[PDB]
Enzyme design. Sequence first.
Site, short mmCIF file in Angstrom:
data_model
loop_
_atom_site.label_atom_id
_atom_site.label_comp_id
_atom_site.label_asym_id
_atom_site.label_seq_id
_atom_site.Cartn_x
_atom_site.Cartn_y
_atom_site.Cartn_z
CB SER C 130 -32.66 59.19 30.05
OG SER C 130 -32.48 58.48 28.83
N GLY C 134 -27.85 56.90 25.53
CA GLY C 134 -27.05 57.55 24.51
C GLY C 134 -27.89 58.35 23.54
CD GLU C 244 -45.00 85.42 34.95
OE1 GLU C 244 -44.76 86.18 35.91
OE2 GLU C 244 -46.16 85.07 34.65
N1 LIG Z 1 -37.32 57.38 35.68
C1 LIG Z 1 -37.35 56.52 34.67
N2 LIG Z 1 -36.23 56.35 33.88
C2 LIG Z 1 -36.26 55.48 32.84
C3 LIG Z 1 -37.40 54.75 32.56
N3 LIG Z 1 -37.15 53.97 31.48
C4 LIG Z 1 -35.87 54.19 31.08
N4 LIG Z 1 -35.30 55.11 31.93
C5 LIG Z 1 -33.93 55.64 31.85
O1 LIG Z 1 -33.27 55.06 30.74
C6 LIG Z 1 -31.98 54.62 31.09
C7 LIG Z 1 -31.66 53.35 30.32
O2 LIG Z 1 -31.14 53.68 29.05
P1 LIG Z 1 -32.08 54.30 27.90
O3 LIG Z 1 -32.38 55.76 28.14
O4 LIG Z 1 -33.34 53.49 27.80
O5 LIG Z 1 -31.19 54.13 26.57
P2 LIG Z 1 -31.85 53.71 25.16
O6 LIG Z 1 -33.33 54.03 25.12
O7 LIG Z 1 -31.58 52.25 24.88
O8 LIG Z 1 -31.07 54.63 24.09
P3 LIG Z 1 -29.53 54.29 23.75
O9 LIG Z 1 -28.73 54.16 25.02
O10 LIG Z 1 -28.95 55.40 22.90
O11 LIG Z 1 -29.50 52.99 22.99
C8 LIG Z 1 -32.00 54.39 32.59
O12 LIG Z 1 -30.80 54.82 33.18
C9 LIG Z 1 -33.16 55.23 33.09
O13 LIG Z 1 -32.67 56.37 33.76
C10 LIG Z 1 -38.54 54.92 33.34
O14 LIG Z 1 -39.56 54.29 33.09
N5 LIG Z 1 -38.51 55.81 34.40
#
Ligand SMILES: Nc1nc2c(ncn2[C@@H]2O[C@H](COP(=O)(O)OP(=O)(O)OP(=O)(O)O)[C@@H](O)[C@H]2O)c(=O)[nH]1
Lengths: 426, 422, 422
Positions: C130, C134, C244
């Site tokens: 994502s 971070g 491809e």
């Molecule tokens: N589409 C989708 N996105 C998810 C899901 N779970 C988490 N996300 C994404 O994760 C973001 C939330 O932050 P995280 O990616 O979980 O950040 P983190 O895992 O805590 O890692 P750090 O920010 O570095 O601490 C959201 O903006 C979502 O876009 C999911 O089940 N489906």
Amino acid sequence: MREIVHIQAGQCGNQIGAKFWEIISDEHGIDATGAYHGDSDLQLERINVYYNEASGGKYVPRAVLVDLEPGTMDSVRSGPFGQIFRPDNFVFGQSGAGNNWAKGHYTEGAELVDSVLDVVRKEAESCDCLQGFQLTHSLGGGTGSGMGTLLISKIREEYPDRIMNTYSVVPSPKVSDTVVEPYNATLSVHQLVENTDETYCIDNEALYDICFRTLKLTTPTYGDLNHLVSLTMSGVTTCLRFPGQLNADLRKLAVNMVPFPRLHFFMPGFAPLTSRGSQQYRALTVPELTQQMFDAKNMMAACDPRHGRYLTVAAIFRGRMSMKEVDEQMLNIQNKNSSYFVEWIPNNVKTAVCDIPPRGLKMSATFIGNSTAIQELFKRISEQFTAMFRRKAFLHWYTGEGMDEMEFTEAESNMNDLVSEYQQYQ
Amino acid sequence: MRECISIHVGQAGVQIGNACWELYCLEHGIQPDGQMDSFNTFFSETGAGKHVPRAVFVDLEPTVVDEVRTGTYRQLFHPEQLITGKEDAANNYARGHYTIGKEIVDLVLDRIRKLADQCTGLQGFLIFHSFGGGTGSGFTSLLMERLSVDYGKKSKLEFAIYPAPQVSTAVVEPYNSILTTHTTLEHSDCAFMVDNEAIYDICRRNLDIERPTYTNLNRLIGQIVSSITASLRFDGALNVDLTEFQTNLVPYPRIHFPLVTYAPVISAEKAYHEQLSVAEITNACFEPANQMVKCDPRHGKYMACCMLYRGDVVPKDVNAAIATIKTKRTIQFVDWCPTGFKVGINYQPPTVVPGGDLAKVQRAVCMLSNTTAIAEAWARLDHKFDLMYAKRAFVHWYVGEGMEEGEFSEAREDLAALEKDY
Amino acid sequence: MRECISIHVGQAGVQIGNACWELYCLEHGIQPDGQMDSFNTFFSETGAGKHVPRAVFVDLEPTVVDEVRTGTYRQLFHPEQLITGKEDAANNYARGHYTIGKEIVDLVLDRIRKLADQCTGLQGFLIFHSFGGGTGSGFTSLLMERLSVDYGKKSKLEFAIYPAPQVSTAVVEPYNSILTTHTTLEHSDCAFMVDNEAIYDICRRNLDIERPTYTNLNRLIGQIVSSITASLRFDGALNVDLTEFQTNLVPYPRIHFPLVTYAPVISAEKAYHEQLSVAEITNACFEPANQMVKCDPRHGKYMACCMLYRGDVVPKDVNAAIATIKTKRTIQFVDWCPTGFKVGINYQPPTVVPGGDLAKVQRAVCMLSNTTAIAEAWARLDHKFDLMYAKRAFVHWYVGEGMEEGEFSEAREDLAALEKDY
Ligand SMILES: Nc1nc2c(ncn2[C@@H]2O[C@H](COP(=O)(O)OP(=O)(O)OP(=O)(O)O)[C@@H](O)[C@H]2O)c(=O)[nH]1
Ligand SMILES: Nc1nc2c(ncn2[C@@H]2O[C@H](COP(=O)(O)OP(=O)(O)OP(=O)(O)O)[C@@H](O)[C@H]2O)c(=O)[nH]1
Ligand SMILES: Nc1nc2c(ncn2[C@@H]2O[C@H](COP(=O)(O)OP(=O)(O)OP(O)(O)=S)[C@@H](O)[C@H]2O)c(=O)[nH]1
């Protein structure tokens, strides 16, 4: 289907809503208690728009009664048709804002907002589909304006897609019933430019003069005003309530009347209005009404459209006639009133007809029009506000309720921008 | 054996479809329930002495559908072919095209597809709607492109209630009209006229009905569609198909908007006062005021002329009358279209209703052409659109359905290019 | 025989990888422990009736890894492929790129290198993460360049959860998004779309799930990756390789950001209400609202279109439907790219889950293109970055990780140059 919830604020608003309800009981064949006795299926086919499904073959109005004092409460309930309302819809305060906007909106409105939101949400959820709302209050009064502003704000933040109209009562320019009523109108309009999709301006002195001259009554009363109000009532809502060859609803009118979101103030209309010894001698035909559609005599909100320019016109009819006569009459109205009309909105007449005439009249006609005449009213209000705000008189009552200076400054700036835009359209 | 499908959208479309089915039922002797092989073009044989219309009734508002399902013809119509909406577009093309139309287009597409499944001889599609109505513009347009993409080159006929120059239920009618015209232009095989004011004027002066009602309009559409479909529903000397209709009047895909006219519209007391001969009825019908279109055809040129005679009409008399029509100078044609005449003769006399404005007559003719006067109406509508959009009024209503003004503008220039293509 | 490697970083990446492995296990009949030759593209044969995923689960926070190692699929996954962090970057690209990422990148690099050692037929790499996270920005980026420098021209596929224009878990999301996009641009072979808000809207309107959960999103990713990898995991009429995919959609290295869309997303009760034919499903999928991207593709031009049919789909019907798609003017293409169509046919029907939103269907199509509407989202993100960095907010957080503002600025101009390259 397309249920509409009525909320009434202030003593005048409560009286107007009550009188409406007896008029609807006439139109739909409902007695003083709630039983149906109409002679036609058309009255009772769409009774659910203003009534709810009541046990025992009964129907009760979809009304909400709000006040800060129970005096008019008791008079309305003990008056005619008082048993048709359940006791739950009557919610009242015990202090009274005393014709103060700030008090009724913040001090006493704090403990009434929960009740009014609860009752309106109950009415919305208990129904099938809430098409919209209709509110009645007086801008001259302080509490009623505050309830109007609070309810429109809460509806906008709760149901932003469901349109409505507000039938506010602007104070009469000729009489200063309340010293602090300019503040009430100021704040009410500042909230209306922002929380209301469209508004009809109802001015006192115009209906007073109509009852005096057009109806030829030496003793005008609040009863006749409420009667004409209920005629406007029925005229606007008959297209939705009753079958028509040209079916219409409040959404159609709102689409046909609002060219800009801030340009939504219109001035309602009713006709014919003739006495016993003129009706039996007048022509009960369309031309007698089209000479009555456009006139400063049978005129609703005291500002002459002749000085300004009409934005667009809506005309609803109820009776037995063909449609082409209406179309050619509208064309002639343009042809002769071209100067009074706007050149860049061709065919600005909205034409619709409800098949069912009101009880006791084989025609009624409701003139829904918009003109830049309200620019004069708004400009006079703005200059009055400047006049007694330059002296800083009577500000203590509002500042004691949590008020502030530049708040009123952006309020007056908003009306200045509104009047400037209306003049630019002119 | 063959069939056709009729589509009804909006209040006007539903009323028109109901009136047309009333015609088709009383012409073939259908009682309101469906009892007592050319009638199979619009009804289906299942069980015993049964017929149901091959139609879909859909509207964003359930008022007209409720009115239809309360008539004595509840047994005549299947309940499942009636579709009830919840949020009427309220004369908004965008509302009925995106907000409510997109989630209810599926069932209708889907089950008109079965209506084609059991009709292997599907000649074409009939569409009845109104430009003024937001539903009848948006939903009709979107289902039109859906028909085009789900059927390819299948013939499709459109019956649209174009708002009159001085008759408009809604002031926002130019927006809906321009939007739907630009949207369905490429796929509209053939779209006709309906002028409500012209209908009222003709009814008041020809039928001399000082107080007409939309029932007169309903059979005005009903008799037009009956005269058009008599070739498919009844044999004749030279029957005409739906394909030939678009073959003759669409040499170029841009111009496919012919006007329609009927002859005659005469009451029973006046029917005593006049019996029809070919020359008089044709020359009366060719008269501009007899046309149910509020555009004088003599202003421009004539594209082509199609005659639909029904009843005991002699082809030789047809040829002689049409020739003497040609010679006179009130009728003019384009230089590159000298021979644009097609004649369809049917032996079925036009059918009457009890209690109707029209009189019961053994012969009739349908007036079918595409005059240049339609360009006048198109130019006037474009001018009104320019005037009332120049200050950008009522645009925010379409904005709240989620688009910006650009598409409005290029629809305006597309229709301007259509107008100047003449 | 051949294999592929899937990489999961962050909470979103770990959840996505878990869902994809759930798909790959239930499609091939893997019980939670690993028992009962195309399944070897993602699982390894050792011992007796054994398979384990070829994946690495890494996150700066051990919450998601702990959740994974508490499910019934503990026996399914090797314990050593799960990596637990201690200091989450907390939506900070610099934190997860320098402070914690630099000292834990070694083991993962190191042992994915063995995952390649025993997989001599390594087709490519799959990356799920994502932008908003971070960790999922910084660690994913750094391991992306590490992959590029340790493998050269090896194909690598990225699945990124781009924060939506109005959906943002963190307000500092523009910083992470711009930084990671500028950092991995040169090495990102192919990066897709995920719009959470568009997923919610489609689930609420198409599947009619008023109360969906991230499981729906998890198979939204799962079905997308399954449709992409069906060619590698199952034979077909014309299978498509990972190479491809980047060959067709990357004529220039600057533009390698195609959007993805699935067809259809229909519940079982609605699956009773609609069976799939090629024309209807393709034209529905090409509809902008059916796209899981909150950018209308009709705003700009179309780069290329790739079809991934799976199941009993006729190639001739494919060609006819694609042609009639081409002719219509709602679809437009660039002048120098007239023939940019590649079709991949597979005979494996899409696989269903018990208790899932999707309905069990024998055929499906995957919608694969790179529209110009992505430039709108990029420009909006750049504008938000300019607004919220103009007063230099939240910069000190990245400063405490030890860099000054310069790199922020030139990343902004790099992405501006990318935006204006269209
Ligand atoms: N589409 C989708 N996105 C998810 C899901 N779970 C988490 N996300 C994404 O994760 C973001 C939330 O932050 P995280 O990616 O979980 O950040 P983190 O895992 O805590 O890692 P750090 O920010 O570095 O601490 C959201 O903006 C979502 O876009 C999911 O089940 N489906
Ligand atoms: N000729 C003819 N036109 C009709 C008739 N009934 C309705 N119409 C047309 O319908 C228009 C009125 O709007 P409608 O089409 O009914 O709109 P609607 O059904 O409410 O659908 P929405 O506008 O989307 O809410 C008029 O301008 C007429 O042209 C009819 O009986 N005869
Ligand atoms: N047409 C009409 N006007 C009325 C009626 N009753 C009062 N009014 C007008 O309303 C104005 C006063 O508004 P009102 O609602 O009484 O103020 P208020 O703030 O509610 O008064 P309070 O409850 O604080 S004491 C007066 O100018 C009066 O003319 C009525 O029954 N019909």
